[PDB]
Design an enzyme around this catalytic site. Structure first.
Site, mmCIF file in Angstrom:
data_model
loop_
_atom_site.group_PDB
_atom_site.id
_atom_site.type_symbol
_atom_site.label_atom_id
_atom_site.label_comp_id
_atom_site.label_asym_id
_atom_site.label_seq_id
_atom_site.Cartn_x
_atom_site.Cartn_y
_atom_site.Cartn_z
ATOM 1 N N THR A 159 8.538 24.104 4.525
ATOM 2 C CA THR A 159 8.208 23.646 5.852
ATOM 3 C C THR A 159 8.431 24.639 7.065
ATOM 4 O O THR A 159 7.550 24.918 7.707
ATOM 5 C CB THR A 159 9.315 22.397 6.000
ATOM 6 O OG1 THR A 159 10.487 22.590 6.018
ATOM 7 C CG2 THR A 159 8.717 21.353 5.408
ATOM 8 N N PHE A 174 10.112 16.380 13.070
ATOM 9 C CA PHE A 174 11.562 16.530 12.385
ATOM 10 C C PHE A 174 11.651 15.023 11.959
ATOM 11 O O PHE A 174 13.085 14.803 11.854
ATOM 12 C CB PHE A 174 12.600 17.178 13.222
ATOM 13 C CG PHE A 174 12.088 18.497 13.596
ATOM 14 C CD1 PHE A 174 12.033 19.215 12.298
ATOM 15 C CD2 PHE A 174 11.724 19.023 14.603
ATOM 16 C CE1 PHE A 174 11.737 20.703 12.442
ATOM 17 C CE2 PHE A 174 11.756 20.443 14.787
ATOM 18 C CZ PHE A 174 11.502 21.154 13.550
ATOM 19 N N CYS A 231 15.386 15.393 10.570
ATOM 20 C CA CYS A 231 15.821 16.644 9.948
ATOM 21 C C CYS A 231 17.078 16.913 10.308
ATOM 22 O O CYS A 231 17.213 17.383 11.458
ATOM 23 C CB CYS A 231 14.679 17.658 10.017
ATOM 24 S SG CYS A 231 15.143 19.237 9.462
#
Ligand code: HEM
Ligand code: PLM
Length: 429
Positions: free
Chosen positions: A245, A371, A378
């Site tokens: 990512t 996120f 995240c």
């Protein structure tokens, strides 16, 4: 009832998707059918939500929880019950969450900054040592950097990706385990257990990283440390969830700056004003506000993690009209289309405008989800954004980036989104 595109008997809705391009296919069907629709495969049904009001509604933690139903269930084979692939109700999730949350704060990035600079300097030195007219592959070198930064900062292990022509045995073994979505998974478990064993026997040195954290700090609620198997799962989890990512973010940022000269000129302005020393300091990296807005805009246009899934905790309704059976329907958030919701973002959704994030009050939150959401968002957000800002600032400090081939964007999707076949040339400044 939830809008549905079509159906072809046993084939469901699959004749409308390119299996190799799921996110992009869903984007197309969204452009046809709007903020919510459902896709029938041979085995199951998926509900794809993209309008910011419905996305915000499904983001309500009282009513919906994180689902690990499809791709993540495959990743679970080697990620186990780590932060990425465990259900919220599983004990190790909130254990490891409490244990590791302080290490991922922005203040904690002060501790990782040096190691990040180490790998960044390696990247810069590689690009500086190129011969005239040599081309660089942006995704591969960005991946080298991201994997090495995660290994070094997290458990003090050097993959030495820049000393290899072919990506590390770990990353190709991981790509083989993911392209399944056993030999490889066992070799991964053993390498991680090797680093864990090296640390638990003669763990004298104050490494002060993620592995030492998981070995030392217990969960304040239960009073327990993470066991060895879960620590292995966590290390594998950090590697997978971070490197791809974040390298995608770097690649897309380089692409957008190459295609929008004004934003690059402003980035050069800011970097030259702030980056005065040979190596950046943590304070200096935080002063790179325009670069961080460039990254925010890049994640808006092409979220490298393009979707996350949710499941309904009890039977309910969305938008006041669409019903969801409890814990049976897997809701997928189509993050790119959400990030292109004109009612939330305005009309210039396709323009690359970092200045959208100039004024932190004006950013339409809950229509911006690069996120994830809520407690299952995240954990590496600040890690990723700090590292990406550092690398972008250093690259702009040393190099002139040249779109020598007039690159035409082709969004490849594996588990994450990235530019495919993206090559540029570089000159010193
Ligand atoms: C541009 C960079 C990154 C992006 C776009 C990104 C995206 C995401 C997203 C969307 C989720 C939620 C997934 C879901 O709910 O199904 C997530 C979770 C997670 N990410 Fe990241 N990530 C990035 C960088 C990182 C880094 C650098 C790390 C670790 C060093 C990391 C580790 C994790 C972990 C452990 C989780 C699980 C969180 C939990 O529920 O406890 N990610 N990430
Ligand atoms: C870069 C743009 C990507 C867009 C992806 C849309 C392709 C799917 C369109 C409908 C399916 C047509 C052929 C797909 C393969 C198949 O049907 O077996």
């Amino acid at each position: 009832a939830i809008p549905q595109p079509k159906t072809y008997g046993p084939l469901g809705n699959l004749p409308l998707i390119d299996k190799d391009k799921p996110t992009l296919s869903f984007i197309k069907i969204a452009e046809e059918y709007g903020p919510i629709f459902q896709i029938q495969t041979l085995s199951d049904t998926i509900i794809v939500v993209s309008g910011h009001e419905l996305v915000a509604e499904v983001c309500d933690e009282t009513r919906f929880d994180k689902s690990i139903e499809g791709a993540l269930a495959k990743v679970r084979a080697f990620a186990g019950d780590g932060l990425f692939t465990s259900e919220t109700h599983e004990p190790n999730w909130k254990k490891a969450h409490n244990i590791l949350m302080p290490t991922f704060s922005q203040r904690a990035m002060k501790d990782y900054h040096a190691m990040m600079v180490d790998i960044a300097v390696q990247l810069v030195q590689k690009w500086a040592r190129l011969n005239p007219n040599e081309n660089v592959d942006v995704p591969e070198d960005m991946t080298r950097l991201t994997l090495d930064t995660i290994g070094l900062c997290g458990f003090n292990y050097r993959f030495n990706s820049f000393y290899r022509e072919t990506p590390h045995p770990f990353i190709t073994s991981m790509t083989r385990a993911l392209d399944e979505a056993q030999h490889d998974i066992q070799s991964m478990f053993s390498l991680v257990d090797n680093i864990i064993a090296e640390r638990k026997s003669s763990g004298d040195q104050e490494e002060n990283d993620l592995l030492s954290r998981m070995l030392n700090v217990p969960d304040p609620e239960t009073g327990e440390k993470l066991d060895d198997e879960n620590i292995r799962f966590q290390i594998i989890t950090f590697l997978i969830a971070g490197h791809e990512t974040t390298s995608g973010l770097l690649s897309f940022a380089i692409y957008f700056l190459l295609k929008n000269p004004d934003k690059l000129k402003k980035a050069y302005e800011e970097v030259d004003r702030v980056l005065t020393d040979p190596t950046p300091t943590y304070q200096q990296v935080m002063k790179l506000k325009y670069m961080r807005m460039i990254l925010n805009e890049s994640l808006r246009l092409w979220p490298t993690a393009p979707a996350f899934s949710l499941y309904a905790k009890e039977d309910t309704v969305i938008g006041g009209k669409y019903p969801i059976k409890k814990g049976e329907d897997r809701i997928s958030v189509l993050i790119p289309q959400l990030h292109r919701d004109k009612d939330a973002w305005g009309d210039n959704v396709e323009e690359f405008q970092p200045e959208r994030f100039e004024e932190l009050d004006k950013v339409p939150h809950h229509a911006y989800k690069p996120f994830g959401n809520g407690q299952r968002a995240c954990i590496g957000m600040q890690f990723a954004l700090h590292e990406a800002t550092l690398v972008m600032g250093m690259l702009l400090q040393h190099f002139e980036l040249i779109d020598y081939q007039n690159y035409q964007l082709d969004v490849k999707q594996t588990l994450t989104l990235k530019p495919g076949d993206f090559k540029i040339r570089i000159l010193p400044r």
